[PDB]
């Protein structure tokens, strides 16, 4: 059931911003590892004396990487005179964020009809303000409220390219990399207590619980058309294997963004390209499930995937799960940086045509049982 | 003239350590951009709860990338019980270094006969102690003294692989990249005042001035066999073009390491490989000199380089300079990170055979006049 109770008009995910120590090196690593193009910048060369911000794009997916310059470069500025292109940026906040959490997501940005109204309505409905609505060049409005931990939900609205003050990147510096990633499917937070997290966010957005069908309890919040999907997890304590949600909280110094799920228009091509680059600057993937898992896929999705398409999942280490409505193909990277905290999921969904509905096939929770069973079965092959 | 006045026995450059916010992303970017292999690690997977350190190698060149974990992981430790593999590491120092300077070199490490003796003699001769000699697994001794700004000169000595507590990297994660870089040729510091810098370092090392033949004054300190080369620059104020040394000091928040010169056994192959990767995660190079500069190379080095080898310099943007003793081929990257501070020089020297003597061909200061003249000449072609 979908009560369509969004308290303001929400459009789509707009971008994800990472707070970095050095935005150049993270952005270049991510660009090569994920096949994302350099498309905009805001830095010293554009007159920004406060922060360096570099935007990567793949299809509709936008990754922003920001790091502070020396505060001495902007010591004469005040907010009315700032050269920052993102007026919510603060040297002290950014340094404290990164020292506390390491590399990670600071902002989950969604495009809304009216960022001022969304901010007002959100805070009137319990949201903790983080940055008030600011109108940029009478063209775009940005505002921020707290989501969980030190992560903010950023609202952006456009009267009618990324943000004012950003410059398009010269073609020579903009190699047209593309491994097939096209948009952000969902963004997942880890918290110590799921109940209060859910009630807070569902409180100020009006997002509703999206229906499903180890070591965690989880729930998914969704916008009216269920295109914005914000799952949240809490750990389950006492298990024989320590909860990965608890390990995240310990190494992250508390709540924060756990994984970003990126939709590919061709998950086979995406994984082939990403795996060729794993050991030459790109991203590593979690261990592949045992061949038993792939021997068990025929009985589960053999009506959706050919044996040749099932063989390709096996070569690439892809997992498969299924709802009553659609099928999901997914795989997880190892952590993106030093700490066992944030990682990336690559996904592709099949089914639920009308365009495709959001969350088609679920999020893969059925793979816990399938993996465990596959692992006992591989142990029995022995 | 070489008075061979080293106060302790110095062998070779051993490694360069960068202090990072995220060592994983910088190390992966550098590995792909420079063609360096992942060869050792010290991190959570090796029992280090304090810092993540990843070592890249190309030939004899060793780049170490280190970032701190959350202090909470090691809050119960004391120095006698530490899990850090580099006992000089300190969370607070590393965070303050990176927040102050951004990404840059913390340690210039040289292998010495006896790190305890080198540290003792250095401090007895004016060096500011940074970290006392520590013996690791009764196998290697490390000690550190201040070099300039927040950069330390690190001594390492071996009784008889990198450091104890580091683990060799699994072959699967160790792709054998190689673009021809083989060793560190020199490491250059920028300071506000050259005189006191030179006197301090020459004071405690016994390193002597190495003889030569805009916007800077410079001098080179060398070890007995002149294989360790530590140039230092200060700005020249008042020039019509602002000194790049002064720009460095402003953005770096003071003195620090300006450039690392990496010797290639085949600078043509190195530059071809690095330039193919500039826009797909690697390093960018400074603008190429005008074709006039290459039309002027025949008259200057036409006895050393074929016209086909001179054409290859032109395709790759390589600069050429010459001493009374040897010839130098060199090129400079754009800054390695967000700030216009540290950059890399790729070099190859020809001449001075006996093995090759250090500094063969100088350091390229003759290219200031050659570039300027070439630029006026290209303007005249018009
Ligand atoms: C626990 C663990 C330790 C080490 C290596 C992998 C894993 N591991 C996963 O991490 C995992 C994730 C993140 C999702 C996910 O993407 C998700 C969930 C669940 N709920 N929602 C809303 C999502 O988006 C779905 C299945 C997963 N399986 C089966 C699994 O084994
Ligand atoms: C100033 C500047 C602004 C923007 C773009 C490039 C440049 N630029 C250089 O940066 C430069 C360097 C660093 C060296 C060097 O490597 C060095 C020196 C000098 N002394 N020692 C001991 C060295 O090792 C040699 C020649 C150079 N030329 C000719 C030049 O134009
Ligand atoms: Co997911
Ligand atoms: Co040089």
From Swiss-Prot, chains A, B:
<dbReference type="InterPro" id="IPR029068">
    <property type="entry name" value="Glyas_Bleomycin-R_OHBP_Dase"/>
</dbReference>
<feature type="binding site">
    <location>
        <position position="345"/>
    </location>
    <ligand>
        <name>Fe cation</name>
    </ligand>
</feature>
<dbReference type="InterPro" id="IPR004360">
    <property type="entry name" value="Glyas_Fos-R_dOase_dom"/>
</dbReference>
<keyword id="KW-0828">Tyrosine catabolism</keyword>
<dbReference type="GO" id="GO:0005737">
    <property type="term" value="C:cytoplasm"/>
</dbReference>
<keyword id="KW-0223">Dioxygenase</keyword>
<dbReference type="GO" id="GO:0042802">
    <property type="term" value="F:identical protein binding"/>
</dbReference>
<comment type="pathway">
    <text>Amino-acid degradation; L-phenylalanine degradation; acetoacetate and fumarate from L-phenylalanine: step 3/6.</text>
</comment>
<keyword id="KW-0585">Phenylalanine catabolism</keyword>
<feature type="domain" description="VOC 2">
    <location>
        <begin position="183"/>
        <end position="334"/>
    </location>
</feature>
<comment type="pathway">
    <text>Cofactor biosynthesis; prenylquinone biosynthesis.</text>
</comment>
<comment type="similarity">
    <text>Belongs to the 4HPPD family.</text>
</comment>
<dbReference type="InterPro" id="IPR037523">
    <property type="entry name" value="VOC"/>
</dbReference>
<dbReference type="GO" id="GO:0006559">
    <property type="term" value="P:L-phenylalanine catabolic process"/>
</dbReference>
<protein>
    <recommendedName>
        <fullName>4-hydroxyphenylpyruvate dioxygenase</fullName>
        <ecNumber>1.13.11.27</ecNumber>
    </recommendedName>
</protein>
<dbReference type="InterPro" id="IPR041735">
    <property type="entry name" value="4OHPhenylPyrv_dOase_C"/>
</dbReference>
<dbReference type="InterPro" id="IPR041736">
    <property type="entry name" value="4OHPhenylPyrv_dOase_N"/>
</dbReference>
<feature type="domain" description="VOC 1">
    <location>
        <begin position="12"/>
        <end position="158"/>
    </location>
</feature>
<comment type="subunit">
    <text>Homodimer.</text>
</comment>
<dbReference type="GO" id="GO:0006572">
    <property type="term" value="P:tyrosine catabolic process"/>
</dbReference>
<keyword id="KW-0963">Cytoplasm</keyword>
<keyword id="KW-0408">Iron</keyword>
<dbReference type="Pfam" id="PF00903">
    <property type="entry name" value="Glyoxalase"/>
</dbReference>
<dbReference type="InterPro" id="IPR005956">
    <property type="entry name" value="4OHPhenylPyrv_dOase"/>
</dbReference>
<feature type="binding site">
    <location>
        <position position="259"/>
    </location>
    <ligand>
        <name>Fe cation</name>
    </ligand>
</feature>
<keyword id="KW-0479">Metal-binding</keyword>
<dbReference type="GO" id="GO:0003868">
    <property type="term" value="F:4-hydroxyphenylpyruvate dioxygenase activity"/>
</dbReference>
<feature type="binding site">
    <location>
        <position position="186"/>
    </location>
    <ligand>
        <name>Fe cation</name>
    </ligand>
</feature>
<keyword id="KW-0677">Repeat</keyword>
<keyword id="KW-0560">Oxidoreductase</keyword>
<comment type="function">
    <text>Catalyzes the conversion of 4-hydroxyphenylpyruvic acid to homogentisic acid, one of the steps in tyrosine catabolism.</text>
</comment>
<dbReference type="GO" id="GO:0005506">
    <property type="term" value="F:iron ion binding"/>
</dbReference>
């Amino acid at each position: 059931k979908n009560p369509k109770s969004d308290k303001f008009k929400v459009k789509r995910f707009h971008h994800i911003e990472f707070w970095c120590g050095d935005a150049t090196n993270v952005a270049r690593r991510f660009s090569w590892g994920l096949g994302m193009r350099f498309s905009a910048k805001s830095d010293l060369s554009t007159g920004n004396m406060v922060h360096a911000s570099y935007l990567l794009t793949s299809g509709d997916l936008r990754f922003l990487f920001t790091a502070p310059y020396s505060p001495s470069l902007s010591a004469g500025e005040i907010k009315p005179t700032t050269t920052a292109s993102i007026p919510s940026f603060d040297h002290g906040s950014c340094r404290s964020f990164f020292s506390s959490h390491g590399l990670g997501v600071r902002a989950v940005a969604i495009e809304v009809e009216d960022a001022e109204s969304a901010f007002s309505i959100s805070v009137a409905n319990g949201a903790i303000p983080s940055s008030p609505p600011i109108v940029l060049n009478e063209a775009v409005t940005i505002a921020e409220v707290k989501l969980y931990g030190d992560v903010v939900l950023r609202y952006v609205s456009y009267k009618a390219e990324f943000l004012p003050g950003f410059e398009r990147v010269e073609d020579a510096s903009s190699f047209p990399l593309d491994y097939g990633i096209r948009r952000l499917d969902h963004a997942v937070g880890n918290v110590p207590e799921l109940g209060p997290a859910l009630t807070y966010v569902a409180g100020f957005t009006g997002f509703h619980q999206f229906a499903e069908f180890s070591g965690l309890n989880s729930a998914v919040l969704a916008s009216n058309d269920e295109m914005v999907l914000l799952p949240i997890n809490e750990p389950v304590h006492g298990t024989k294997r320590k909860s990965q949600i608890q390990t995240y909280l310990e190494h992250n110094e508390g709540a924060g963004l756990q994984h970003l799920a990126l939709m590919s228009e061709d998950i086979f091509r995406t994984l082939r390209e990403m795996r060729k680059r794993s050991s030459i600057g790109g991203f590593d993937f979690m261990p592949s499930p045992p061949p038993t898992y792939y021997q068990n896929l025929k009985k589960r999705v053999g009506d959706v995937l050919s044996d040749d398409q099932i063989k390709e999942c096996e070569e690439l280490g892809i997992l498969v799960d299924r709802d009553d409505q659609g099928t999901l193909l997914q795989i997880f990277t190892k952590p993106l940086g030093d700490r066992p905290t944030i990682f990336i999921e690559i996904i592709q969904r099949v089914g639920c045509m009308m365009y495709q509905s959001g969350g088609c096939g679920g999020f893969g929770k059925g793979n816990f049982s399938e993996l465990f069973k596959s692992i006992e079965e591989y142990e029995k092959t022995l």
